[PDB]
Amino acid sequence: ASPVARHRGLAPRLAEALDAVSVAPGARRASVAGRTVTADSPRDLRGRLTNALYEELHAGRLRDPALEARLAAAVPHRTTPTRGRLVEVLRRPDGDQLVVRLPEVTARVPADRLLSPSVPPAPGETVELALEAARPALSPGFFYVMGSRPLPRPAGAVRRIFLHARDADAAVVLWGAALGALEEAAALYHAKVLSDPQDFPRRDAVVLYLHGDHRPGERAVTEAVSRYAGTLTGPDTSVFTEELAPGVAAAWDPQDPRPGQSGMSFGQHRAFALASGLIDCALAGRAEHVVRALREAGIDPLHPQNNL
Amino acid sequence: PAVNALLLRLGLGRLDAAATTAFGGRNDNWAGPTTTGEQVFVKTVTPLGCPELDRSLSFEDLAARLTPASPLRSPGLLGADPAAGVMVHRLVPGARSGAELALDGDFDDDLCRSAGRAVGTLHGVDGLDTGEAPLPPLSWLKALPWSAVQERSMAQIAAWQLVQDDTEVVDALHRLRDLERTVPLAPAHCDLRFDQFIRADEGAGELYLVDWEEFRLADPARDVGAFAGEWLFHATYSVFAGLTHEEIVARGSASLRRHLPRIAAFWQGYLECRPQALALDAGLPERAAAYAGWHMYDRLIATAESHATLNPVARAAAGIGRTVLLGPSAAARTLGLSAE
Numbered sequence A: 001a002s003p004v005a006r007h008r009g010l011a012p013r014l015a016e017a018l019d020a021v022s023v024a025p026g027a028r029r030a031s032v033a034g035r036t037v038t039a040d041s042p043r044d045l046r047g048r049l050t051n052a053l054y055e056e057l058h059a060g061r062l063r064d065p066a067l068e069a070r071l072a073a074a075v076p077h078r079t080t081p082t083r084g085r086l087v088e089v090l091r092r093p094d095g096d097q098l099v100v101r102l103p104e105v106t107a108r109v110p111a112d113r114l115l116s117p118s119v120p121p122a123p124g125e126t127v128e129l130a131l132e133a134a135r136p137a138l139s140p141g142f143f144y145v146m147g148s149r150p151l152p153r154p155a156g157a158v159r160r161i162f163l164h165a166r167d168a169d170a171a172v173v174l175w176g177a178a179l180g181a182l183e184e185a186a187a188l189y190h191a192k193v194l195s196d197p198q199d200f201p202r203r204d205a206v207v208l209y210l211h212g213d214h215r216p217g218e219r220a221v222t223e224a225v226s227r228y229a230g231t232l233t234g235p236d237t238s239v240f241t242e243e244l245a246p247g248v249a250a251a252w253d254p255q256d257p258r259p260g261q262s263g264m265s266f267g268q269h270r271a272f273a274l275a276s277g278l279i280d281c282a283l284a285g286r287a288e289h290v291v292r293a294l295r296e297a298g299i300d301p302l303h304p305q306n307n308l
Numbered sequence B: 001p002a003v004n005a006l007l008l009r010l011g012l013g014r015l016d017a018a019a020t021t022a023f024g025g026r027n028d029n030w031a032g033p034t035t036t037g038e039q040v041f042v043k044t045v046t047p048l049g050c051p052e053l054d055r056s057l058s059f060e061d062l063a064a065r066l067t068p069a070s071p072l073r074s075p076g077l078l079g080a081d082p083a084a085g086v087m088v089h090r091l092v093p094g095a096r097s098g099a100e101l102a103l104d105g106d107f108d109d110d111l112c113r114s115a116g117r118a119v120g121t122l123h124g125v126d127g128l129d130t131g132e133a134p135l136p137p138l139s140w141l142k143a144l145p146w147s148a149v150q151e152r153s154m155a156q157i158a159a160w161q162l163v164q165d166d167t168e169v170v171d172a173l174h175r176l177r178d179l180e181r182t183v184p185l186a187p188a189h190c191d192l193r194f195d196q197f198i199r200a201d202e203g204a205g206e207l208y209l210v211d212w213e214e215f216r217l218a219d220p221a222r223d224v225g226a227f228a229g230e231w232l233f234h235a236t237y238s239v240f241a242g243l244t245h246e247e248i249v250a251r252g253s254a255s256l257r258r259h260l261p262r263i264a265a266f267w268q269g270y271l272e273c274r275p276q277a278l279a280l281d282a283g284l285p286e287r288a289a290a291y292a293g294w295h296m297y298d299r300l301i302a303t304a305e306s307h308a309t310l311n312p313v314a315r316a317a318a319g320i321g322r323t324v325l326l327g328p329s330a331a332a333r334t335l336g337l338s339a340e
Ligand SMILES: Nc1ncnc2c1ncn2[C@@H]1O[C@H](COP(=O)(O)OP(=O)(O)OP(=O)(O)O)[C@@H](O)[C@H]1O
Pocket: B023, B024, B025, B026, B027, B028, B029, B041, B043, B075, B089, B090, B091, B092, B093, B095, B097, B195, B196, B197, B198, B210, B211, B212, B213
């Protein structure tokens, strides 16, 4: 008559939520918060379950220019030092240009954004350019910004921080606050925030990705937003994440030891592993399969916001 | 503001601020009745002298002089303020987009024949812009202007990188643009898609082709290829939006096979209104097929606007586009364009 009792080796919040979730023997039917979900094979239920879990446990439930200005104006820095091999120089009387292979694409950058060396070097020679930190279109639905400081060489592990936000107004202030805090602590981060007003509210209305050492930045963002939790944020957070305040949660990007079955978003990754283990039980107890599934995805079943 | 200015100087009154809806597209448009109870469509292309407005007028000058026996129609230009970039047209009543028709199953073989006749007629010359059209943008295959990267999603940037790093594709596109200097050119839309067509009377009336901002003297293979490629794109993506890559290709291949009659229909409508298109242009089917291949990259990159990641249906579609662009002769035969 106790959730931890019937579901051991599992974070409590999780073991609790597995009480609202049933998968029938055969793996063609399942219940998730008293919403039923139906499929014609196991394999097809794997997908529909993942989506139902993702919606109830992780999430719940235009690009207005005014907001974007409000959101854009809330940024400390204006530029980020970006490396890449030079290809070619283009002499123009209009203004010279560097053809640079960035890591995501080959681009044509005004040569006045060079920073190192300050004299355009030979082709192939690494160069460091100064590019805008605000990228409003890069993440559909989201205004997006990169830290003023270059992220680590391999990027490595990444700490996500989710900030619920009731509305645009909420978000603006949480945005300004969080970025203000993050530059002061000199965090190696990226970040983004919903730029569509009629899409709030959302648990991940603001996301912050933090590299190398997250403590300074985390500690810093925590304190800057304490004041607002509950009212400007919303109470509730993903069951996969570690809460730090009302509307403020966090977790690590997914590390996964299995090939092919890897490289998802944090929510979908967990929900996938969770749905997998539930599904694997129904093809005959239950929490032992769930727990095994999580560990094959490199998720700590006691601390699902963390990895092995 | 200049819309009512112009609408008044034209005998049309002003537009009811309500009942005046707005269709999609980058440019601002207003549709609905005016105070004199006449139905208008108003488009605005803001200037700095816009080449797009001039090209749109170069067409409405030709279309005004067309007999009713013509398979090619334009709704009708009521007037225009070149200075401020405003254009007024007769609104087509209860107009459904060819893109809605496609998804609803109603862009059938008969309507594809209509479209071909219309496009065949268009292609059968002073007043016209003769500049090369920037599609595909060749310098972007070398490098994207940094300004443009800041208006693209992560998925668009990743698609462009795939293209940029594919030497065979880039080179095929160069050869295709060079042929345009050495072939019989013809009046051409240069931006053809299902959503550049409208059918009147909720999809029961006449077929209109619109948006003539790219109207030029160009390779007619652009228009044939664009329409074939609309079906290739539809068949291998729009209809399919954790399967295996081999399962996604097989599903897409079958979908394509079943949508081929649509392209053969268009080509027969085209040859009905332009039977001697191959007289001095034997490469037209091959070139059309290459443009259809590129058209798939074009639509993929456009639909990826609203994505952070390039999903595996997108990638499989892109793979078919590369088969068509790098193998245009075989694709012409399979798409039904080699027909005589
Ligand atoms: N006369 C008309 N009557 C009814 N509908 C029309 C008329 N003219 C255009 N439309 C519809 O409105 C849409 C918008 O017009 P148009 O395509 O010219 O816009 P645009 O801003 O040039 O778009 P884009 O460049 O993005 O294609 C058309 O695609 C068509 O569906």
